[PDB]
RNA sequence: UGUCUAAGACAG
RNA sequence: UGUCUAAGACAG
């Protein structure tokens, strides 16, 4: 009914939460930015398009700042040393119903649920073993 | 320990739960598949490589199938009507701390959290607006 | 004395037991087939030939059918939706004594023993990890 | 979780027991070797590749050495007088469910069970008759 | 029986010890990382392969961070100024028994034993004299 | 002082001890050999060079022989059945402090310490798993 | 860098 | 990077 609203990106349970809010809608690409310099902000963008006759495709991008030893509002170079990039590409066949889509979402939440292999590997600077 | 363990990918409160298990590590690609025929299984893969001299890149893939029974040559075979594909790439600088990495994980979780814009949009078969 | 006899290929207690019986032994190839429709039968063949001047080569083959009914034009025939094919070759130097051979057999048995890597990987539609 | 572990290849009660341990797993090929002189070790390798679009192919290999000492020039080296070579290929359609696979495994186990035709023929330096 | 466990890499007798723990097993290459940013971590990797018909070869790599004036979690460039690299290549003929191998290990420990020329030379930024 | 002294390479508690002594420094390569015939001796070599404008590189080599008596031309000669080769290269930045270097040494010692994964694996003729 | 018959050869 | 019949193909 209008989902383009701000939300909590990083939840630290009230104390030090990171909120990200609508900052751009140019070309139908929703963008959320955190309240920072663009170089240190948390950024989220999302868009959908029918990639092919059979599929629709969501493209979600997230940018997360390196915070340890960060100097707020400072000029930190090289940019590549201070930022992590997440590029998510979700492909859904045009036959998927809302239910099918809810399932897909659940699978994504499950993939990243706290305690599961993938997130704990990433959280620990590790691979699988 | 060993983080290469099975985990529940789709949670439907104990019943109807899609759990996925380690199934392969050949060629440095950790694989987990659901307990079905290979033709109908859910599949999750992960791999980390040192992409740049100063970056590490995780490549994660999830395959959500739409199971069906096809009648090929007058014989029924377990198959997939179609598949939904999640393909994500994460680039983290080598300067990232475990705390810096935890931040990335929390952000990804918050991104897909129930009720937030993106999963809402996806589950409703719509864009952000 | 004869070893070209009937034997249990698949052991399901005393019930579902799959038995295979001698069918033919032409051209040095012993063939065993389970009962009922040849089209849905299990097949096992074995032969030993003196490959080189120092080696004897065994060639064991097993076919596991996926029993199904095929309807076409309203006509149904008992068929095999597909078959799983096992093809093994065992080479043993002519210097192997009967003890040496028993050892080779125990090695083959151990390889497939319940709970060991290979059989469990196979049983679970998986690879090694 | 991991199935790439140590296991008993030859079972001589609790004594002469031949154990094989993970040695290497490069290029999708899992290798296991028994201890002591590599020159007299038992070898087991396994790999699964998606052969056709409908089949996955397993390739299991086992080497049984005939332990001996080789004296030459008065210099003795632990060697293998010769080796027995087992090379098996198992093809399984992607339609096989976990049950289908367990059956295939039980079939392989039955084929080599003590007292059945093939294993006894082999064990006795014989063929079928 | 499973040697891929964490261990103490730098022993300072309890007070300030550096522990390194399993972090990756992609392609059979065991990797241990210390609890740091990947750029400041202590890293250890190990693998074996039969380099030739006659020899097996262990390849051990160690990475040690420059600690003096280090800024924990900071971005320190150039990478080459803050890291030491150890590349160990151990070649063992396939005739070596476990005893032969134990000897080889002892020789390595002896080479680096506290008080011996090589380590004291390295520890003092010196050569031999 | 002079760090170019003899030291015990293989320690077997005073008896059976392989001690190695300075034997050459020609061309900047410090050499130590055990007290045997050159054909059967243990050999340790070391050299440091300023590899880069900002690195120093140590190159260390150890040769562990398998002594034997060969009968060449009807005459017995002291020889080596084979040799095991340890070849290691260490690169330390010029910015490394003596304390930074001590760290490197301690890490190498901890690496090869009795009971830790790597020496365990080596001595057992296996990989890490 | 990777291999070896190993301070010297080999292969990129 | 972008697409797909998806750890492997395609297109810059």
UniProtKB/Swiss-Prot annotation, chains A, B, C, D, E, F:
Keywords: Capsid protein, RNA-binding, T=3 icosahedral capsid protein, Translation regulation, Virion
Record-level Gene Ontology MF annotations: identical protein binding; RNA binding; structural molecule activity
Annotated compartments: Virion
Biological processes annotated in GO: negative regulation of viral translation; regulation of translation
Quaternary state and interactors: Homodimer. The capsid proteins form dimers that assemble by group of 5. Twelve such pentamers are linked together with free dimers. The homodimers binds to the viral RNA via an operator hairpin, but also to many other RNA sequences in the viral genome; this interaction probably shifts the virus from the replicative to the assembly phase and ensures specific encapsidation of the viral genome.
A Pfam family the protein falls into: Levi_coat
Stated name of the protein: Capsid protein
Function: Capsid protein self-assembles to form an icosahedral capsid with a T=3 symmetry, about 26 nm in diameter, and consisting of 89 capsid proteins dimers (178 capsid proteins). Involved in viral genome encapsidation through the interaction between a capsid protein dimer and the multiple packaging signals present in the RNA genome. The capsid also contains 1 copy of the A2 maturation protein. Acts as a translational repressor of viral replicase synthesis late in infection. This latter function is the result of capsid protein interaction with an RNA hairpin which contains the replicase ribosome-binding site.
Family recorded in the similarity comment: Belongs to the Leviviricetes capsid protein family.
InterPro entries associated with the record: Levivir_coat, Phage_RNA-type_capsid
Keyword Transcription regulation among UniProt keywords: no
